[PDB]
Design a protein around this nucleic acid. Structure first.
Ligand SMILES: [Ca+2]
Ligand SMILES: [Ca+2]
Ligand SMILES: [Ca+2]
Ligand SMILES: [Ca+2]
Length: 511
DNA sequence: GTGGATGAG
DNA sequence: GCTCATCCAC
């Protein structure tokens, strides 16, 4: 065409962390450390990524390495079942707390699969610690925060990156990058760079057409192109290619410094990014161009239920409520309401109003349908761009134990368990303090139990600190007092042995 | 006040 | 299957 399909406004928008995600030109990444717990144990025990390791808790498998999966092992399997699929399996049990001890510890060469009765990790007196995974995640997150100025911690093993600044800055100012032996970005993109510093454009003006010398710019990773479309046809393509390069370097850092492999989804929107990181794994990168967004969504592997918020009960409700076919529901949503979000909105209002349609258990806000339609309209088209957003502050933290057998028959027994809970909540407060770079101190403690016959007892109250700071010993002390008060409360009633015991902290001052 | 429902996979 | 934090009809 004569001009690009994009404006200067939308390009310059890339350079503002608050608005960059709204640009059609946005370059978002979703990076997943797959089989995270297995990777962490592999690296700790000096093993390779091709070693069939399985992370184990009790008799179940919680993480399965991709090497282990070659043998048909899945989380579905027990350790005994997985060992009949691959006798060379390397099960590694999580760290555990022992009842009464204030620290966790690894019991290597111990597990329910080893014959020696000496080398067991009894479920009855032990509690699992996920601290080693928390810590490793923290190391990753610091390396991500180092390479990019807007990182969302989507979960323990997944982040989103907004690569707009980085990309926009490469595009305009990076005089070091070279496409070939003789070709450099500064020469190839001299026209866009001279126009931009010149300042003579109107922001709403369309961009200049991309130069031919940019078409040799290489994507890093696997560009999803079923229909064999051209790789670089406009500026959104240029930014994305740059992103993939930047994104590869970041992932190599994770591998170089910590040894973890990742999958990466690169695209304009967060939901499309997450689909792509999962599309091939492990150690892979998938780029989804804007012009392939419909090729990607329609490939066959996705349905309306594949999206972040639609994976569960609300997802089903929509299939029902929108009479969507059990295949190509996304496409089906595009064509039925082809022109605008509102068409979906009115339909919803009509279905919204029906005798069969519940109002009581409905996961659908009647007031909030305006947005629900726009979400779906745009999600169906791969243009639903949310901002990268910090997770809100914690309100509650809990550490409990499901007790079986008669281990818990006394106040003394309960107190041994509280020690483990305190130990654990202390290390979790610490993870939080680093995440926030702020002191976190809880003012309220709650002690909960379930009796022999599954009745619930509970006691909340303040915890006081002799110092300005938080001290685990003051949390325990209050816990002990509550546990003791509940003992008296249950004297000639159904009580021991307990079947469940827990500690919860709330009312944090993030001073 | 909170048991139960809910999200991912 | 499980997890744990978070939300809200009861
Ligand atoms: Ca994952
Ligand atoms: Ca002790
Ligand atoms: Ca995960
Ligand atoms: Ca185009």
């Amino acid at each position: 065409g004569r001009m690009s399909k994009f404006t200067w406004k939308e390009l310059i928008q890339l350079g503002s962390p608050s608005k960059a995600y709204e640009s059609s030109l946005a370059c978002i990444a979703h990076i997943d450390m797959n089989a995270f717990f297995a990777q962490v144990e592999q690296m700790r025990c000096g093993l390779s990524k091709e070693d069939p390791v399985v992370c184990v808790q009790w008799n179940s498998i919680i993480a399965v390495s991709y090497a282990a999966r070659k043998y048909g092992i899945s989380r579905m399997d027990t350790i005994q079942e997985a060992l009949k699929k691959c006798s060379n399996l390397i099960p590694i049990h999580t760290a555990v707390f022992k009842k009464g001890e204030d620290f966790w510890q690894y019991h290597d060469g111990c597990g329910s699969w080893v014959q020696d009765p000496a080398k067991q990790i009894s479920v009855e007196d032990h509690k699992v610690s996920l601290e080693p995974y928390r810590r490793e995640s923290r190391k990753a997150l610091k390396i991500f925060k180092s390479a990019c100025d807007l990182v969302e911690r989507a979960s323990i093993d997944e982040v989103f990156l907004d690569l707009g600044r980085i990309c926009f800055n490469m595009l305009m100012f990076d005089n070091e990058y070279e496409l070939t032996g003789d070709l450099k970005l500064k020469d190839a993109l001299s026209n866009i760079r001279e126009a931009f510093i010149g300042g003579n454009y109107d922001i709403n003006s369309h961009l200049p057409l991309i130069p031919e010398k940019i078409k040799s710019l290489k994507f890093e990773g696997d560009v999803f192109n079923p229909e064999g479309r051209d790789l670089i046809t406009d500026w959104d393509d240029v930014i994305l290619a740059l992103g993939s390069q930047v994104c590869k370097g970041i992932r190599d850092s994770i591998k170089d410094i910590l040894g973890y492999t990742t999958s990466c989804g690169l695209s304009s929107t967060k939901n499309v990014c997450k689909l792509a990181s999962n599309y091939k794994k492990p150690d892979a990168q998938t780029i989804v161009k804007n012009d392939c967004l419909l090729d990607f969504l329609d490939c066959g592997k996705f349905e309306i239920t594949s999206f972040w918020t639609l994976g569960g009960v609300l997802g089903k409700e929509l299939i029902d409520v929108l009479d969507l076919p059990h295949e190509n529901s996304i496409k089906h949503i595009r064509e039925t309401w082809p022109d605008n979000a509102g068409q979906l909105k009115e339909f919803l209002d009509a279905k919204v109003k029906q005798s069969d349609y519940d109002r009581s258990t409905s996961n659908i806000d009647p007031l909030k349908t305006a947005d629900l339609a726009e979400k779906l309209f745009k999600l169906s088209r791969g243009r639903y761009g949310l901002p990268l957003s910090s997770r809100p502050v914690v309100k509650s933290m809990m550490s409990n134990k499901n007790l079986r057998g008669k281990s818990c028959n006394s106040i003394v027994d309960c107190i041994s368990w509280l020690e483990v809970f305190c130990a654990e909540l202390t290390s979790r407060i610490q993870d939080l303090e680093q995440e926030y770079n702020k002191i976190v101190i809880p003012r309220t403690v709650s002690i909960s139990l379930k009796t022999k016959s599954y009745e619930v007892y509970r006691k909340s109250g303040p915890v006081a600190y002799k110092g300005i700071n938080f001290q685990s010993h003051e949390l325990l002390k209050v816990g002990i007092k509550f546990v003791t008060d509940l003992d008296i409360k249950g004297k000639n009633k159904s009580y021991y042995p307990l079947t469940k015991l827990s500690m919860t902290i709330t009312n944090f001052d993030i001073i």
